[PDB]
Amino acid sequence: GNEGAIRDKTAGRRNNRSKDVTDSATTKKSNTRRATDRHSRTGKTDTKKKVNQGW
Amino acid sequence: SLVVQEQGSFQHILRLLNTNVDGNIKIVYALTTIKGVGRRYSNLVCKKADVDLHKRAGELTQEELERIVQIMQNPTHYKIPAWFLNRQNDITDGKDYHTLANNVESKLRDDLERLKKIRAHRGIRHFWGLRVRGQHTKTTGRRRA
Amino acid sequence: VLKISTRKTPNGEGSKTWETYEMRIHKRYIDLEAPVQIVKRITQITIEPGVDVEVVVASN
Amino acid sequence: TPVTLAKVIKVLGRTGSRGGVTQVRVEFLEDTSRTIVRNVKGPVRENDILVLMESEREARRLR
Amino acid sequence: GRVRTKTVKRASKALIERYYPKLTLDFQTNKRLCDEIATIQSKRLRNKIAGYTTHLMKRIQKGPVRG
Amino acid sequence: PGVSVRDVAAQDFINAYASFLQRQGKLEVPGYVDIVKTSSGNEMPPQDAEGWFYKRAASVARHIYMRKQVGVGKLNKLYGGAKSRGVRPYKHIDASGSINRKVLQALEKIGIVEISPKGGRRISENGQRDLDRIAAQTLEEDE
Amino acid sequence: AVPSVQTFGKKKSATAVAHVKAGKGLIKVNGSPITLVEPEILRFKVYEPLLLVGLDKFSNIDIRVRVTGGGHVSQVYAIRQAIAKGLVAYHQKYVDEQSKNELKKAFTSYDRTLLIADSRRPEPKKFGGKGARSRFQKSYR
Amino acid sequence: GTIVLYAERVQDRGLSAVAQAESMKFKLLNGLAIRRAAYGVVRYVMESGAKGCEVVVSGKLRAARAKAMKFADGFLIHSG
Amino acid sequence: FTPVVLATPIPEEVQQAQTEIKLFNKWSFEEVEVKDASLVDYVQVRQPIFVAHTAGRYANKRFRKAQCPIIERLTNSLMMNGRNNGKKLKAVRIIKHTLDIINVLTDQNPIQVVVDAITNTGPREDTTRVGGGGAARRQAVDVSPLRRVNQAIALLTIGAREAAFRNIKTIAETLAEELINAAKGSSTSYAIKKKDELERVAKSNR
Amino acid sequence: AQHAVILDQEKYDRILKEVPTYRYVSVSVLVDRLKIGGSLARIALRHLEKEGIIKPISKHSKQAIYTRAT
RNA sequence: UAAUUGCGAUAACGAACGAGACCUUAACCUACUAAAUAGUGGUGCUAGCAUUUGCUGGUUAUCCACUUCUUAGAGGGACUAUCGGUUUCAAGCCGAUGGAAGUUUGAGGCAAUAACAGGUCUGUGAUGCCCUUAGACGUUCUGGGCCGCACGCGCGCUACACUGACGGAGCCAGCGAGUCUAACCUUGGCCGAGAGGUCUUGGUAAUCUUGUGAAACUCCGUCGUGCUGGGGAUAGAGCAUUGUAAUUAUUGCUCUUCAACGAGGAAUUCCUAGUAAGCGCAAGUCAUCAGCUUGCGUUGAUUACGUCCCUGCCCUUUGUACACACC
Numbered sequence A: 001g002n003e004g005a006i007r008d009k010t011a012g013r014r015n016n017r018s019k020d021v022t023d024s025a026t027t028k029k030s031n032t033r034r035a036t037d038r039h040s041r042t043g044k045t046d047t048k049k050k051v052n053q054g055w
Numbered sequence B: 001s002l003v004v005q006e007q008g009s010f011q012h013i014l015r016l017l018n019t020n021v022d023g024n025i026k027i028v029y030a031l032t033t034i035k036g037v038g039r040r041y042s043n044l045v046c047k048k049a050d051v052d053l054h055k056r057a058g059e060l061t062q063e064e065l066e067r068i069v070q071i072m073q074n075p076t077h078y079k080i081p082a083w084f085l086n087r088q089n090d091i092t093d094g095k096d097y098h099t100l101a102n103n104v105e106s107k108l109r110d111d112l113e114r115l116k117k118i119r120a121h122r123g124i125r126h127f128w129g130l131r132v133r134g135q136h137t138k139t140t141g142r143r144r145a
Numbered sequence C: 001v002l003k004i005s006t007r008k009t010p011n012g013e014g015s016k017t018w019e020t021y022e023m024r025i026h027k028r029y030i031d032l033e034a035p036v037q038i039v040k041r042i043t044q045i046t047i048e049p050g051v052d053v054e055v056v057v058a059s060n
Numbered sequence D: 001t002p003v004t005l006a007k008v009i010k011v012l013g014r015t016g017s018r019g020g021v022t023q024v025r026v027e028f029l030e031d032t033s034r035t036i037v038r039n040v041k042g043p044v045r046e047n048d049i050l051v052l053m054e055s056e057r058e059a060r061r062l063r
Numbered sequence E: 001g002r003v004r005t006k007t008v009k010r011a012s013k014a015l016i017e018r019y020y021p022k023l024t025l026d027f028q029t030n031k032r033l034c035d036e037i038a039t040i041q042s043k044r045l046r047n048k049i050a051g052y053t054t055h056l057m058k059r060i061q062k063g064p065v066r067g
Numbered sequence F: 001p002g003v004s005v006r007d008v009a010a011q012d013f014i015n016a017y018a019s020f021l022q023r024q025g026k027l028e029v030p031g032y033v034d035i036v037k038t039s040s041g042n043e044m045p046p047q048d049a050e051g052w053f054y055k056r057a058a059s060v061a062r063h064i065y066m067r068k069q070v071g072v073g074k075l076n077k078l079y080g081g082a083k084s085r086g087v088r089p090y091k092h093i094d095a096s097g098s099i100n101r102k103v104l105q106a107l108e109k110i111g112i113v114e115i116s117p118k119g120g121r122r123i124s125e126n127g128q129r130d131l132d133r134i135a136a137q138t139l140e141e142d143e
Numbered sequence G: 001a002v003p004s005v006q007t008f009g010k011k012k013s014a015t016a017v018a019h020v021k022a023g024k025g026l027i028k029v030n031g032s033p034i035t036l037v038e039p040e041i042l043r044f045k046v047y048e049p050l051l052l053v054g055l056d057k058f059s060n061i062d063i064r065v066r067v068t069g070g071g072h073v074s075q076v077y078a079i080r081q082a083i084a085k086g087l088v089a090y091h092q093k094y095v096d097e098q099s100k101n102e103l104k105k106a107f108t109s110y111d112r113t114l115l116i117a118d119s120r121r122p123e124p125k126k127f128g129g130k131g132a133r134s135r136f137q138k139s140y141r
Numbered sequence H: 001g002t003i004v005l006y007a008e009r010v011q012d013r014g015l016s017a018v019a020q021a022e023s024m025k026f027k028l029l030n031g032l033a034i035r036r037a038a039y040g041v042v043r044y045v046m047e048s049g050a051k052g053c054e055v056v057v058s059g060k061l062r063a064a065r066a067k068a069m070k071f072a073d074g075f076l077i078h079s080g
Numbered sequence I: 001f002t003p004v005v006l007a008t009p010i011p012e013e014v015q016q017a018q019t020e021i022k023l024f025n026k027w028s029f030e031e032v033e034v035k036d037a038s039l040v041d042y043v044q045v046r047q048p049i050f051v052a053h054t055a056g057r058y059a060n061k062r063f064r065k066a067q068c069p070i071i072e073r074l075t076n077s078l079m080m081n082g083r084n085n086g087k088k089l090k091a092v093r094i095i096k097h098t099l100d101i102i103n104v105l106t107d108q109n110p111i112q113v114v115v116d117a118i119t120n121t122g123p124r125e126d127t128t129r130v131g132g133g134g135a136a137r138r139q140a141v142d143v144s145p146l147r148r149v150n151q152a153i154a155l156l157t158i159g160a161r162e163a164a165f166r167n168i169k170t171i172a173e174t175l176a177e178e179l180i181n182a183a184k185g186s187s188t189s190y191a192i193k194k195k196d197e198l199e200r201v202a203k204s205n206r
Numbered sequence J: 001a002q003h004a005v006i007l008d009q010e011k012y013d014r015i016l017k018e019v020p021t022y023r024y025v026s027v028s029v030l031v032d033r034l035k036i037g038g039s040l041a042r043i044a045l046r047h048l049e050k051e052g053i054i055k056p057i058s059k060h061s062k063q064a065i066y067t068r069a070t
Numbered sequence K: 001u002a003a004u005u006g007c008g009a010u011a012a013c014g015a016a017c018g019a020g021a022c023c024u025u026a027a028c029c030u031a032c033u034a035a036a037u038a039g040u041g042g043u044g045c046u047a048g049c050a051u052u053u054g055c056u057g058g059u060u061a062u063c064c065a066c067u068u069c070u071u072a073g074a075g076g077g078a079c080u081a082u083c084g085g086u087u088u089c090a091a092g093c094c095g096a097u098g099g100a101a102g103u104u105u106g107a108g109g110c111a112a113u114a115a116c117a118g119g120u121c122u123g124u125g126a127u128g129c130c131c132u133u134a135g136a137c138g139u140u141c142u143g144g145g146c147c148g149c150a151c152g153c154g155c156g157c158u159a160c161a162c163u164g165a166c167g168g169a170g171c172c173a174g175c176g177a178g179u180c181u182a183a184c185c186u187u188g189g190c191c192g193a194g195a196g197g198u199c200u201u202g203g204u205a206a207u208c209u210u211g212u213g214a215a216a217c218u219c220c221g222u223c224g225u226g227c228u229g230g231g232g233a234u235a236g237a238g239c240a241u242u243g244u245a246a247u248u249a250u251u252g253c254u255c256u257u258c259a260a261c262g263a264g265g266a267a268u269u270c271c272u273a274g275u276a277a278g279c280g281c282a283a284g285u286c287a288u289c290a291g292c293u294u295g296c297g298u299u300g301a302u303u304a305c306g307u308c309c310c311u312g313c314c315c316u317u318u319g320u321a322c323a324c325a326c327c
C-alpha cells in the first residue's frame, strides 16, 4: 500500500536521475518495410481469364 | 511632490523581523524582502500603520517601523480582513494566522510533513521530488534536482 | 447565414483541409390592414413549397 | 576625396545569379559626352543618379 | 496577366466580320450594340467581348488586321 | 455662452470633479476602500488610496450623464481590462460590482444619480445641474 | 427648414455621418467640439480640412458628426472625410459651382483621401494559418 | 390525417441519375455482363435525349484485385 | 493673419500657424534642402504635412515608396521589433518628441537635421556575394539612391533602437542623438560607422 | 542600490549651480550627471520649475524637455 | 500569359473537355422599390447650462416628412478605359490621367484525364473473407487507466522589460450564438474583497443579452535600470462554481512562495498590402475544462516587384534489354 510506496527506496526522482538513459530513447522511426509497397506478398495472382470474365 | 533635505536622520539598511531591509528603496517594496510579505500585504500594513508610502525604508521613524512590525504579526486586531491571509483556518487550532519571516520556512515543512506522515498521495508525491498538482510529467521539468 | 465548418477527411491523415457549408435563411414580413375575409383568401392561396408563411394578429 | 556623379540612361538588365544586381549605362553631368556601364544593388529606373566613388572601371557579367 | 481567352477574341472577329458598318471606335456604344445584335449570358463576358471588338476596330482604321 | 460637460476634455473634467468631491466632504466611502483592489484582473490596488473613490465616482457620474441609463453590470465591464493569467494568454475580465454599486448608491444619496425605469441608473437633474457647473468652472480656469 | 445636406465618410468599417445645415459655425463631433477629438496626436488630421480651405467658410454652417463602428484611428479618417465632403456637398447645392470646385481643388491637391473612400479592406483568413497569407509552421522531421 | 402521401410517375426516368444508378444495380444484381449493363444504361440515357452521360463502376469483379471503368458518351462540362 | 471666430472656437496657435504656412507639428517645411545631389527625388519634403500619419497606398507600385514624406518614413520605421509592430501612435509621438529634442540642440530645422543624417549615412557603393566558384569573393557595386535612402532609415533607427534598449535614456533621445551625430558624421554614431565600414570593404574589393 | 537615490545636501547645491549650460534638460539628463535616480530626478524637474532656470517646452510621461531661462 | 493564355510560325483547318467563362463574398450608387424588428430631420412633452435666437440630453409611438447613413430586392458599373512609351508596333507588357475599383479587381467555391497497394474496415445497420460468440472479443455495472517519468523529437503559450510594468483615467470593432414540452443567451436590483450568491427580468430574436463600452491602444501619474515593481514556473494555506462524483490537485478567486529566462550554437519556418507582425473576440468542442482550431474585426510597417544560386517540380531533347514499368 501507501506505506510501502514511500518506504520503498529505489524510488523517486533522485534514483532515476542517477541512472544512465537507454538509447532506444533517442532512436528513429524504424520504418520496417515500405520499399516493398508495390511488390505483392500474397504470392498469388489473378489470371487473364478470371479478370476478362468479370470485367 | 516636494524637495526635502534631512540630516543624518535616515540609515541605509535596517534589520527588522530577523531579516535585512535596504533603505533607499521605497518602504512598501523595501518590506517585501521579508518572507511572507508580498506587495499587497506590505502596502496594506503600511496604509494601516499610518505611514507615508512616498517614503523609503531609510527614512521612517523607529516608532513608525515599530508599528509596522506590530501590525504585521497581528493582522487580525488591526482590522486587516482574514481573506488577506496566508494561513486561514490552521488545521489544528483552526485559528487564522499570517506566518512571517523565518516561520514560513517551518510551516511549509510542517504541512509537507503532515501529508507524508499520514501517507497521503500528495505527501508520497512530495517525498519523490515530483510535481504534485497533477501536471503531466512526461515532457516538462527535466533540469531541476 | 448558417455556417458549418468541417474537416473533409472522415479520418485524420493528410494536410488538414477545412470546408465550410452554409444555408442562407431569408426572412421577410408584410403588414396588412384588412377584413377577416381577404386574410384567409390571401393565406390559403399564394402558398408555396419552400416559403414559410406565418400570420400573426393584434398590436402586441 | 573626389565625388563623381553620373546620370542613369537606359536600364540594361539583371546579372548576378541571384539577380539583385542591375546593369546600367550612365552619363556624368560634370563634363558629359561620355558613357560608362555600372553595377547597382538597389532598385533603379531611368534618370536616377549614381555616385561613382571612382570614375573609371566599368564591369560586365556577374556570377 | 490580361490576355483574353479564345471565346472573346473569336467573338470579336465574327462580329467585326458581319457588322463593321454600325459599330465604332467607342466601347460604350459597342457595348450596347452587342446586347441588341448578339446573345451572351453574363454582363461580364459581354463587356469583355465588346472591349476587344472595340480594340480590333480601333487599329483596323489604321490599316488591315490579319484574320 | 452656456455650457454642458461634453464641452470639456474627459480628464480635465473628471479631475476637476474629483477634486470637488474631496474638497466637499459629502460622500459615503465604503471603508473597505484602502484594502480593496478594483478588479480581480488587477495586481495592485490604486496608488491614490485616500481618494480614487472620488475618481471613479466622478468617472461613473460623467459616464451616466452621457447616456440614458447604465447599471452595475455595464460599469464592471467598462472599468475592467486585461488580466495576465500568468503563463496563459490574456483575457478581458470584468471589474468588481461592489465598488461600482456602492459608487452608484453614494452618488444617489448625494443626489447626482437616480434609479431609472427600464433599468439601471439615470443622470439626475441635480446631477445635470452640478456637473454643468463644475464643467463651467473648469473652462474658466483656462480663461 | 433651412439649407442642409447630409454626407458621410468611411475607412475600414468606420462610417462617419455629417449634417451640414446653415448656421453660425459650430463644429461638433458626436456631441463635443472638434477641438476635443482624440487620439490628440492626430487632431490636426481632422482640423485638416478647415485649415486646408480657410478657417472661415464655416461661418454660414453648422456641423454634427456621428461615428459608429470602426476603431480609434479609422474613426478619425472617417470623420475628416465626411467634413470635407459635407463642405463640397453644400456648396454644390446652395452656393455655386466655382466655389465648389475651388474647394475640391484644395482637398485633392493635398489629400489623404478626403473626398474619396479608401477601398482597402480586410482579406479573409484561410485555414492553415492564423493569417490570410501567413501559414502555420511545418517541420519535415 | 395531418400527413398525406401521393405517388407520382417521373417524366422519363432516362434523365435521372438516381433512377439509372438503381437500374445498373439491378442490371448487375440480376446477373449481367459489366460492359453490357453499363453500355445499355448509357445508350438509353442518350436515347432519352441527354446532352451527355458518364457511368463509373469501381470495385471488384471475380479477380481479387479491384479496378474501375469509365463509360461515357456525348457531352459533359465538369466545373463551375 | 487676421483671426476668425465661429460658434465652437478654434484656438490661436491653431488658426495662426495653420492657414498661413502648412508647417509640421509646428516646424517649417520650406527651406530644408537636400545637401547631396541625387537623394533629391528620393527625399520627399513638399508636400508639407501636420503630422506623420497617413492611410497611404505606397506599396502597390515599385517606386511609389519614394513619394511618401521622408519624415513619416522615419517614423514608420520606428514601429518594429515584434512588440511594437503597428503602434504608429506610439511612433508618431516619439518623432514629435525627437524633433523637439533635436531642435533644442544647435537650433536648425529639426526636419532638416533628419535630412542630413539621412543623406550622410547612405552607402555610395557597396558589395555583394558573387559566385566565381564556391570560394565566393565579394564584388563591389554602386548602390542606387533608393537603397541609399532606405538603408539610411533602417541604419539610423536601428542604432538608436539598440542604444535605447536596456538603459535610462529614452527612445526619443537615442533617436535624436543618433540623428544629430549623423547630421555631419562624427563617427560616434552607429549609422555612419556602419556606412563608412560598408564603403571601406566595398573599396577594398575593387 | 548604486547611488543617486536620496538628497545629500551638497546634492541640492549641485542641482542649482550645475544646471545652466544644459541646452537640454530632462530625466535622463539628470541621471547622467552622476546623481539622482529617475524618481527624485522627476521631483527635481518640478521643483527646478518652482522658479525659472528651466523653460517647459514639452509635455509628459516618458518625455520631458527643458531649456535654460533667459 | 497565372494558364495548350494568346500572338505568330505553320500540312494543317476548324472544334470539344480542363483553364477561362460561371458562382459566392468584399468594394461603388444622395438613381429605383420600402422599412415602430434599421435610422435621420422637424414638432409636441420635458431636464441642464446660458440666456439674444443658442448648446447638450430625456421621452418602442404624442404626431408629421424623408431613405443620406443600416437592411436586401431589382438594376447599373469595368471592358486593364483614355492618352502615351515599348514590342516582330502581333498578342501583350510598362507609365501618366480618370475612376469605387485597373496585381485573374481582392479573397474564395467549383475543377478534366491519370497515378498511389497514400490514409480511413475506429463515422456508418457500407462491406467480402478470417476470427470470436455464454468462463464472450456481445453487453452492461463498479473501480483503475489513456495524465503514469532518467530522457530524445515536433506544434505551441508566456517571457527576458523603460517603444516597459504597474495604478488611475480615456474609450472604439467585426464574424457569431442562444430555452418546448425546457432550463439556453442573460440586462436590471441587492449581498459579497474576489470568485460567486440571490430576487426579479427581456429574447425562439435586425425586437432582448449587445453600442457584445473586446484587447492591443491613447492620456496623467508611480517606478528608474537593479534577476528590479522585468518574468511568473514551482509550492503552501483558505474560499467558491460544474457534476452522481473533483484524490492523481476540472475550472474560478485570495494571501503567500518568486525558479529558469539578460535575445538564444548548428540549423529551420511563414510571408508582398489593409498583407506581415502585434491585439483581442465569436464560433466548434462544452455539465465543467483552450495555452487548439475555424473564422472575425482592431492597430498597422520594413523590404522585392527580380532572378535560377540553393531546394522542389514541370517541359523538351536523348538512352533503355524496363511495360507488374528502377520498389
Ligand SMILES: [Mg+2]
Pocket (backbone or CB within 6 Å): B032, B033, B034, B035, B036, B037, B038, B039
Ligand atoms: Mg515576499
Ligand SMILES: [Mg+2]
Pocket (backbone or CB within 6 Å): B134, B135, B136, K147
Ligand atoms: Mg491534469
Ligand SMILES: [Mg+2]
Pocket (backbone or CB within 6 Å): F079, F080, F081
Ligand atoms: Mg482601464
Ligand SMILES: [Mg+2]
Pocket (backbone or CB within 6 Å): F077, F078, F079, F080, F081
Ligand atoms: Mg476596456
Ligand SMILES: [Mg+2]
Pocket (backbone or CB within 6 Å): H077, H078, H079
Ligand atoms: Mg469549361
Ligand SMILES: [Mg+2]
Pocket (backbone or CB within 6 Å): H079, H080
Ligand atoms: Mg473556373
Ligand SMILES: [Mg+2]
Pocket (backbone or CB within 6 Å): I083
Ligand atoms: Mg506582449
Ligand SMILES: [Mg+2]
Pocket (backbone or CB within 6 Å): K067
Ligand atoms: Mg440608401
Ligand SMILES: [Mg+2]
Pocket (backbone or CB within 6 Å): none
Ligand atoms: Mg489616381
Ligand SMILES: [Mg+2]
Pocket (backbone or CB within 6 Å): K117
Ligand atoms: Mg499500405
Ligand SMILES: [Mg+2]
Pocket (backbone or CB within 6 Å): K120, K121
Ligand atoms: Mg470507412
Ligand SMILES: [Mg+2]
Pocket (backbone or CB within 6 Å): K146
Ligand atoms: Mg492521448
Ligand SMILES: [Mg+2]
Pocket (backbone or CB within 6 Å): G136
Ligand atoms: Mg501541424
Ligand SMILES: [Mg+2]
Pocket (backbone or CB within 6 Å): none
Ligand atoms: Mg496601462
Ligand SMILES: [Mg+2]
Pocket (backbone or CB within 6 Å): K192
Ligand atoms: Mg465576506
Ligand SMILES: [Mg+2]
Pocket (backbone or CB within 6 Å): none
Ligand atoms: Mg418570457
